[PDB]
Amino acid sequence: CRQXCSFGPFXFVCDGNXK
């Protein structure tokens, strides 16, 4: 999977993976 923050405020922090 890739890491690009799937549940963040914007989408550039990356606090998790699976999307």
Ligand SMILES: CC(=O)OC[C@H](O)COP(=O)(O)OCC[NH3+]
């Ligand atoms: C360090 C900074 O600017 O914070 C980045 C985001 O706002 C972090 O917010 P958050 O931790 O509530 O969401 C997680 C980001 N996917």
